[PDB]
């Protein structure tokens, strides 16, 4: 238990970390002419659709879950 | 000069073009809803009468009609609840065996498998227990009948009627002027007089005519459907002649100042009636006759239209000292000009006294088989706290307002508020050092008792076993109120209460009030309740005195009470107004009563309420409060975790219910965490994204969807917080008292 | 009438006001013939009453509530604990003057490091001296 | 041109009775500052400070601690009394600034001979990208 | 440990703290030490058995050797 | 009660990444801020205007991001926890018929398990299980102080040190000791920081205290 709580909790520590990289890569070391038309730029123009999705599935997910386990409880 | 009656008439026409129109007291409101943020703000500024009109005639007249409402919500209450006691209540069965039978009010349907809430309570009764402590009441009163209980409701329901068509006509037909509602005198000379006054004297009435005949042969012991109607009672002193001897003598005693001969109704006992568990109805006799006396004395202290009287100004102005200056001058024009400072004053008083009311009453039970019933207790005590913890709060909010909105400096020179605001550096400073000793003295002996249980040196932590902290004062008091009827109080027969000391009071086998000893662990929760205390009277005292301004916000007056922040200029000023104050000061009061009642519910359960097992007490939790409150994990564990298993095993029972809330609350605790930690930009640019995918498919609304303001976010998070808390502890206590006691 | 509460100096624009606390002439004199609010004596010897009267009261505490307390020997391990409390509290002081004077004659960095070294010598004899008082005390 | 009035020391001040909120010791090591106007009738206002004072007939003078809330109490005299005043910044060996009106003409007034300090000509987007300016001392909104 | 792994609760440490009580000493000796000790939930004595360890000579020149390491980094 | 389990965990690994790559990808600008970019990653905000500006800043991303992360992470932890915890003692039953409701996991769960570890010290006496005992409190104080710098922000505290700031340069035999620097208060940022970093540390010791002491004390 302790060794699978410990990796756990470090693999999440680090995904937020991985995230937050990323966030400060976009802030600070991001060149919209080098990287005009790659996938960077495509990923960037569309934005609105990936996060409008993810609210879509993580609403779904919530509701749905939550819905069950209150409706069993 | 000369107090009077000034109406206008018909000033306000009763149309229903307005209800069509949302938004139209205010001018901000009105042109449409642009953003939700109008939505949102056409309630938050609903009765903000202030800000819908500058006239204080407008204003007063608004407040004296809202007044008559809130009075009819009230009448509907009143009748609901005496309807249902009459039709869906088993208060006839629970009048002849009130020892076994459980109150109950409350049935529900069969729709999807609720028919389980319906309790076995008794009487050949299913449905819901109830808690109000109305069945006590209406007993208390005389009723034993279930007609009386719909005529109760009928005219309750009718009073409702009365009070709408009073508010209706008050605003709409024969309004008062202004020069009407600044007659403080005449208001005082009668609600001194005609309201408390003459009311405690025809409450006294009835006890005598109706409440003590009807209880005396309850008491006795008889089946209810026997005894006389109180009419009977009343008419007749024939009847009371036989159970109360000195009304063969009618008024003569009366008139002749002979009251002594009044003495069998007229008793000054004290103590707790041995049948009942409640206080001698000829004791709450004798008091009411008393203070009713006593107020209509009070009634004609102020001077109105005859030469007889003093003067509120007049009084006010004459008491001016060397440390003071001025004193109260100008304190006269502020209370009768500013709405807000006598909301402040009320509901501070008003709190208190409903704090004083469940004190009171958990001590001395004041009605019959009310004791005994541990639900009820624990229910009354609770509610009350919380209701004046809330008051308290809004006073707070209210003497900021006043503060903010209604000071003026110029009629406020060298007097007690310009002293106060002129030096409110010195006070905080030192209610700061307060707090942090008290903080530190308090909370920090529960965690030496925790670190040196934890290292195994229970010799060195503070409690009856080592180090000891005894309420010497609080002792000392207790045993000078023992010592009192025949002492210090000659005429009085027995103790007021049996939590000074002497005897157990048991009733049906259950103790109805048993001597509360104070040790090192009533020490240190008292301590920490004068902590709490002092850090919300801290936050309040503080957002009341800053209102205005601040040496980091000089102009904050003029961005008004209710503003976000300003900038994160001069390091950040987030939450500086007086609203957020008030919005702090909620958190630290719900930390205050949470802990009141936690420290009563396990002192109760510990040391008074239990069974008589013909050799001794044996009460709930057996003792554990004495030696195992002195330290955190005693709370966590021996409170809890320990009493808890009522609530988290409720399922399949009728407690189910409590089971559901406990659980629910939890929830809604924890959603107010969304509401506190986040910001509005996030939720902005969220909203705008989802917005977006709306513009995708031409749904999109007409009306912007906004996020939250800061305000109304920290609103919704405290409101969610004190919900979620609130039913916790709520559900938690009934499934524990109904499950046990 | 009698007017107590007023502004310090007559400045009603100072953030102070004389109070029958602040001025009166009791309180006055008894705090400016305090060792600390006497500017012409010599930094050392105040530093030696101030570490005197320190040292001898900080005993107190740990041997009447230490860990020992209740063996016999609580004398000697609270006169030890009392004077490493006086010499971590030294350290400081010399932290506070080595810091803020860098750049009353005891507001002064030579000043200072004699009020130092008085406030040594004289804090150890109050643990001493405390200690002593333990062992030669009738009533004690 | 405009010639800055000088600050004269000897100034009736405002009928005050003490605060807590006063000057400090950041007043005697760092610097103060004064503001100075002229009231047409003796009349009581609110004291940035907390709590009431009097102003006096005439020329009257008023020490704060920070200059914002010097600017507060002049708006403060502005909209409610109608009066005009003049803040000078002190500093503790006795050099004066003369500070808020500084052209005699308020802040909100052109005053055509003012320097147009801090203005790009750019909009809110025509300012540099961080990556161009990397490890530059600087923000990208001054160059 | 090695002669009996599944009996036997792994020590990590030592405890030395002058604050414990007598009854405290006595409640964290465990494992057969001498003195107050911590029980192991990192589970390296189960790596270290598996790899080849098998005697405390051997953890101690595993020991020294990552010690001259990290000063040779 | 896999099933319910395992749409949680994907309830959270998705709201979690909502919050992340929202963050992440309106970082050089939103329609609130058009010019985030020329502000860094971390900032307060943008004032009061336009309606408000809180946690508006990728950083407070970030900042939000990890409570999440520590909730899925707690969810994962506790399924596992307790799907072996029926493993290791023969009673799947306990789980597989107790999972399907959260009633099941607060009572025959937490509340379960816990009898072990708030047992470690009392007025009893103590045993080896009085450490987890102390920890479990202390992660429950760490914790509960992180919210104090999570709700409070800013401007209550700015005036209340300044206040004790004029107390303490007012007192006799205290105004010969004067500060080099200026007390003022945290930051907001680096409140929020503050607070989160206690938040963490609270929710990683008391799992960590629980865990240990409730498989250690049965097995
Ligand atoms: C290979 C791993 C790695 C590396 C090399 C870096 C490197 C860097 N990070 Mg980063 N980061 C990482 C992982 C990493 N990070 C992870 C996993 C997270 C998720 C938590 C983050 C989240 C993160 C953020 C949000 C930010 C950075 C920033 C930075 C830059 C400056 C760091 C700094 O400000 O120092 C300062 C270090 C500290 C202030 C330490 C704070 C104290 C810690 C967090 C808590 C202490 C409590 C303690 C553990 C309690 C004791 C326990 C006991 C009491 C029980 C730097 C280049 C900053 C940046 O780039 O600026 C734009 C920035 O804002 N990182
Ligand atoms: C128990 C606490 C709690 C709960 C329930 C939620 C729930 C949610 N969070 Mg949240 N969060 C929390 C704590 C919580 N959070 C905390 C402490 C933080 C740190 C500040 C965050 C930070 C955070 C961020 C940054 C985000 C969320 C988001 C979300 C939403 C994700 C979508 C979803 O799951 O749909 C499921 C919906 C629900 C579970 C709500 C239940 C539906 C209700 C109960 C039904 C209504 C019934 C009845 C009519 C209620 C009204 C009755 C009353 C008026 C009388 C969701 C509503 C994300 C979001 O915005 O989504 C797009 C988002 O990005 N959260
Ligand atoms: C404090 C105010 C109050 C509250 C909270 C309740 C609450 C309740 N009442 Mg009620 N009641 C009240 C006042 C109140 N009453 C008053 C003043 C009267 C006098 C007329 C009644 C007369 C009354 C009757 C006769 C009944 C209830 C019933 C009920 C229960 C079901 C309500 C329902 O589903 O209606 C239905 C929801 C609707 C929208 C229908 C409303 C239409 C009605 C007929 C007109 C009002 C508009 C419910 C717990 C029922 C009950 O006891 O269930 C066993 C029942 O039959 N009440
Ligand atoms: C049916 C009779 C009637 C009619 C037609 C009107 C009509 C009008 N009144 Mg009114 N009034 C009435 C009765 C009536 N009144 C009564 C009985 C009172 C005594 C309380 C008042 C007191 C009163 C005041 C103080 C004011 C008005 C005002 C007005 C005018 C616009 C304000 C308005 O009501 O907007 C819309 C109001 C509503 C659509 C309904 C109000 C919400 C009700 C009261 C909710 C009741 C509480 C309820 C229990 C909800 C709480 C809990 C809930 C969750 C269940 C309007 C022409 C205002 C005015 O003069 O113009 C500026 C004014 O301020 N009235
Ligand atoms: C004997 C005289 C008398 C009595 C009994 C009352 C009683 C009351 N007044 Mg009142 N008042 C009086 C004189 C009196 N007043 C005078 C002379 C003035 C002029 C200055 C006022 C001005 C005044 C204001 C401005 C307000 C009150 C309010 C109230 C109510 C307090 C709220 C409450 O819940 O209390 C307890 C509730 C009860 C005891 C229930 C009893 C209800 C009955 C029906 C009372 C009706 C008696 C009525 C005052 C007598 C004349 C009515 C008749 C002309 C039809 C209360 C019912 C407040 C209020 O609630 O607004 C309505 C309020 O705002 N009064
Ligand atoms: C407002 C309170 C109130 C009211 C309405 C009554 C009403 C009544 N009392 Mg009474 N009484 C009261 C208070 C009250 N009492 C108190 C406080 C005491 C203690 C001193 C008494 C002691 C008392 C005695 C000893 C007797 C009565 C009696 C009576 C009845 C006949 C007197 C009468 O008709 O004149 C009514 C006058 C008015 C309604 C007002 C006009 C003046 C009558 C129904 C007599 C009776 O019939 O016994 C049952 C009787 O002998 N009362
Ligand atoms: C006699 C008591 C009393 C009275 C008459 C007032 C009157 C007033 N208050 Mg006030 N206040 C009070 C007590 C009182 N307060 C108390 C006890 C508190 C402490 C909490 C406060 C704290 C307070 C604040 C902080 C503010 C006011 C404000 C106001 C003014 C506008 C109120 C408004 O229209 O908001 C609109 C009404 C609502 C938004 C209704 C919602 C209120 C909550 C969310 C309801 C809670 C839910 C409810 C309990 C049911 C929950 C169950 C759920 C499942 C449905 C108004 C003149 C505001 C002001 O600006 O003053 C000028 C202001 O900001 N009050
Ligand atoms: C468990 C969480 C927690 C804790 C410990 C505190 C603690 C404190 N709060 Mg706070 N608060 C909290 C939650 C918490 N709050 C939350 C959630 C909110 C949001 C509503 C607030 C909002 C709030 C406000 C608005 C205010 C406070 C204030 C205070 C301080 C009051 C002074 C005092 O209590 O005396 C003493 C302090 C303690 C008892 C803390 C425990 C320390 C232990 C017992 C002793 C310390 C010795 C230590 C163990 C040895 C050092 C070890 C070494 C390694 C360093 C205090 C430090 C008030 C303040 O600033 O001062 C008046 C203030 O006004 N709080
Ligand atoms: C936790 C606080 C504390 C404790 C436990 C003690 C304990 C003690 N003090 Mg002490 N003291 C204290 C605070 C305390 N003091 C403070 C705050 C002051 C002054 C501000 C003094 C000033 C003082 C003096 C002057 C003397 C003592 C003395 C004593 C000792 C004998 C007391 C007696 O029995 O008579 C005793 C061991 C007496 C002694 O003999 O010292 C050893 C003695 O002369 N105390
Ligand atoms: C079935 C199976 C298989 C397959 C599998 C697969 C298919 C896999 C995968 C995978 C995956 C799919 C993975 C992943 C993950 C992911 C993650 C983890 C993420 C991420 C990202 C991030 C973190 C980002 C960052 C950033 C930002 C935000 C900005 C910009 C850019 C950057 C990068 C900087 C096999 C046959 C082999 C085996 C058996 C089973
Ligand atoms: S974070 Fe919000 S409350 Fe704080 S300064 Fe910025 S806008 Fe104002």
Not at chain 2, 428 to 437: A, E, Q, R
Request: with cysteine; aromatic share 14%; charged share 15%.
């Amino acid at each position: 238990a302790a060794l699978y709580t410990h990796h756990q909790y470090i693999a999440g520590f680090i995904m937020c970390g991985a995230f937050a990289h990323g966030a400060i890569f976009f802030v600070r070391d991001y060149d919209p002419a080098q990287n005009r038309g790659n996938v960077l730029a495509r990923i960037l123009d569309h934005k609105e659709a990936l996060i409008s999705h993810l609210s879509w599935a993580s609403l779904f997910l919530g509701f749905h879950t939550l819905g069950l386990y209150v409706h069993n409880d | 000069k000369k107090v009077k009656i000034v109406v206008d008439r018909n000033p306000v026409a009763t149309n229903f073009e307005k209800w069509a129109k949302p938004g139209h007291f205010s001018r901000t409101l009105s042109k449409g809803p642009t953003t939700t943020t109008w939505i949102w703000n056409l309630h938050a500024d609903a009765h903000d009468f202030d800000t819908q009109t500058s006239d204080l005639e407008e204003i007063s007249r608004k407040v004296f009609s809202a007044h008559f409402g809130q009075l009819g919500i009230i009448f509907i209450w009143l009748s609901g609840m005496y309807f249902h006691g009459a039709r869906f209540s088993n208060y006839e069965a629970w009048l002849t065996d009130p020892t076994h039978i459980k109150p109950s009010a409350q049935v529900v349907w069969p729709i999807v498998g609720q028919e389980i809430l319906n309790a076995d309570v008794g009487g050949g009764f299913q449905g819901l227990q109830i808690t109000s402590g109305f069945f006590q009441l209406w007993r208390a009163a005389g009723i034993t009948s279930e007609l009386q209980l719909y005529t109760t409701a009928i005219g309750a329901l009718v009073m409702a009627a009365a009070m709408f068509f009073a508010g209706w006509f008050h605003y709409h037909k024969a309004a008062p002027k202004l020069e009407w509602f600044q007659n403080v005198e005449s208001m005082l000379n009668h609600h001194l007089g005609g309201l408390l006054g003459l009311g405690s004297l025809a409450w006294a009435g009835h006890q005598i005519h109706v409440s003590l005949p009807i209880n005396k042969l309850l008491d006795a012991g008889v089946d209810p459907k026997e005894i006389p109607l109180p009419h009977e009672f009343t008419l007749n002193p024939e009847l009371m002649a036989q159970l109360y001897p000195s009304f063969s003598k009618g008024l003569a005693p009366f008139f002749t100042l002979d009251w002594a001969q009044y003495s069998d109704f007229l008793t000054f006992q004290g103590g707790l009636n041995p049948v009942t568990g409640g206080l001698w109805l000829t004791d709450t006799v004798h008091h009411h006759l008393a203070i009713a006396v006593l107020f209509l004395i009070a009634g004609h202290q102020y001077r109105t239209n005859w030469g007889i009287g003093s003067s509120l100004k007049e009084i006010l102005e004459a008491h001016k000292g060397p440390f003071t200056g001025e004193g109260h001058k100008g304190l006269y024009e502020i209370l009768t000009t500013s709405w807000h400072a006598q909301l402040a004053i009320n509901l501070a008083l008003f709190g208190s006294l409903s704090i004083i009311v469940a004190h009171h009453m958990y001590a001395m039970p004041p009605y019959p088989y009310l004791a005994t019933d541990y639900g009820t207790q624990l229910s009354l005590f609770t509610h009350h706290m919380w209701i004046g913890g809330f008051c308290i709060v809004g006073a707070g909010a209210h003497a900021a307002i006043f503060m903010v909105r209604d000071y003026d400096p110029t009629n406020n020179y060298n007097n007690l508020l310009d002293r106060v605001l002129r030096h409110r550096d010195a006070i905080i400073s030192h209610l700061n050092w307060v707090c942090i000793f008290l903080g530190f003295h308090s909370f920090g002996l529960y965690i030496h008792n925790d670190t040196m249980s934890a290292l195994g040196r229970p010799q060195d932590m503070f409690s009856d076993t080592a180090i000891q902290l005894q309420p010497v004062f609080a002792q000392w008091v207790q045993n000078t109120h023992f010592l009192a009827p025949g002492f210090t109080a000659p005429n009085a027969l027995a103790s007021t209460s049996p939590s000074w000391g002497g005897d157990v009071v048991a009733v049906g086998g259950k103790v109805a009030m048993m001597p509360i000893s104070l040790g090192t662990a009533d020490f240190l929760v008292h301590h920490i309740h004068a902590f709490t205390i002092h850090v919300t009277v801290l936050i309040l005292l503080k957002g009341v005195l800053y209102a205005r301004s601040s040496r980091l916000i000089p102009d904050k007056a003029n961005l008004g009470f209710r503003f976000p922040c300003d900038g994160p200029g001069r390091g950040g000023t987030c939450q500086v107004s007086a609203w957020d104050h008030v919005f702090l000061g909620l958190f630290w009061m719900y930390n205050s009563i949470s802990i009141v009642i936690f420290h009563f519910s396990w002192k109760m359960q510990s040391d008074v309420w239990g069974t008589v097992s013909a050799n001794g007490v044996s009460h709930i939790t057996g003792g554990n409060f004495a030696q195992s409150a002195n330290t955190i994990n005693g709370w966590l564990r021996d409170f809890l975790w320990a009493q808890s298993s009522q609530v988290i095993q409720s399922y399949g029972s009728a407690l189910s219910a409590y089971g559901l809330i406990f659980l629910g609350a939890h929830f809604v605790w924890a959603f107010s965490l969304m509401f506190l930690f986040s910001g509005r930009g996030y939720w902005q640019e969220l909203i705008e994204s989802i917005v977006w995918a709306h513009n995708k498919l031409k749904v999109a609304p007409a009306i912007q969807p906004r996020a939250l303001s800061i305000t109304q976010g920290r609103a919704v998070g405290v409101a969610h917080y004190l919900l979620g808390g609130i039913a916790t502890t709520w559900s938690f206590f009934l499934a524990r008292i109904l499950a046990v006691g | 009438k009698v007017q107590v509460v007023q502004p310090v100096n007559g400045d009603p624009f100072i953030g102070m006001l004389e109070t029958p606390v602040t001025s009166s002439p009791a309180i006055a004199w008894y705090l400016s013939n305090l060792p600390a609010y006497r500017t012409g004596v010599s930094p050392l010897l105040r530093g030696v009453e101030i570490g005197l009267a320190h040292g001898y009261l900080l005993v107190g505490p740990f041997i009447k509530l230490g860990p020992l307390r209740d063996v016999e020997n609580v004398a000697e391990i609270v006169g030890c604990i009392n004077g490493a409390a006086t010499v971590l509290i030294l350290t400081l002081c010399l932290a506070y003057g080595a810091v803020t004077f860098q750049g009353d004659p005891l507001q002064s960095a030579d000043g200072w490091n004699k009020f130092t070294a008085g406030f040594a010598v004289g804090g150890l004899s109050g643990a001493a001296w405390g200690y002593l008082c333990t062992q030669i005390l009738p009533y004690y | 041109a405009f010639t800055p009035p000088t600050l004269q020391s000897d100034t009736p001040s405002p009928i005050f009775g003490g605060s807590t909120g006063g000057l400090l010791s950041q007043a005697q090591v760092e610097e103060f500052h004064v503001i100075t106007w002229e009231s047409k009738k003796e009349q009581i206002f609110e004291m940035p400070t907390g709590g009431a004072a009097i102003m006096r007939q005439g020329p009257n003078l008023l020490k704060l601690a920070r200059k914002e809330q010097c600017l507060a109490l002049l708006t403060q005299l502005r909209t409610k009394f109608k009066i005009d005043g003049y803040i000078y910044r002190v500093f503790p060996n006795g050099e004066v600034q003369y500070l808020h009106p500084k052209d005699g003409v308020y802040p909100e007034k052109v005053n055509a001979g003012r320097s147009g300090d801090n203005t790009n000509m750019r909009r809110i987007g025509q300012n540099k990208e961080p990556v161009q300016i990397k490890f530059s001392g600087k923000i990208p909104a001054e160059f | 440990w090695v002669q009996d792994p599944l009996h036997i609760r792994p020590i990590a440490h030592a405890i030395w703290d002058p604050h414990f009580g007598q009854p405290a000493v006595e409640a964290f000796t465990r494992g057969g030490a001498s003195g107050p000790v911590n029980i192991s939930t990192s589970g390296v004595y189960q790596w270290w058995y598996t790899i080849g360890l098998r005697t405390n000579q051997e953890l101690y020149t595993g020991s020294i050797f990552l010690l001259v390491l990290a000063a040779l980094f | 009660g896999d099933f319910l389990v395992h749409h949680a965990i994907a309830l959270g690994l998705h709201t979690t990444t909502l919050i992340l790559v929202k963050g992440a990808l309106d970082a050089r600008g939103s329609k609130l801020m058009p010019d985030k970019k020329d502000f860094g990653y971390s900032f307060p905000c943008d004032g009061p205007g336009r309606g408000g500006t809180c946690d508006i800043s990728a950083w407070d991303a970030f900042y939000l991001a990890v409570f999440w992360m520590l909730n899925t992470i707690g969810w994962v932890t506790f399924y596992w926890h307790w799907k072996h915890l029926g493993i290791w003692q023969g009673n799947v039953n306990q789980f597989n018929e107790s999972s399907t409701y959260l009633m099941g996991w607060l009572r025959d769960y937490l509340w379960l398990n816990s009898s072990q570890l708030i047992n470690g010290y009392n007025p009893f006496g103590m045993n080896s299980l009085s450490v987890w005992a102390w920890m479990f409190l202390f992660g429950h104080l760490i914790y509960a102080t992180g919210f104090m710098f999570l709700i409070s922000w800013r401007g209550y505290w700015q005036e209340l040190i300044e206040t004790l700031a004029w107390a303490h340069e007012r007192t006799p035999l205290a105004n010969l000791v004067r500060w080099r620097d200026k007390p003022v208060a945290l930051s907001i940022v680096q409140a929020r920081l503050v607070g989160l970093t206690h938040f963490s540390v609270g929710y990683v010791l008391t799992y960590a205290a629980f865990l240990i002491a409730s498989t250690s004390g049965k097995f």
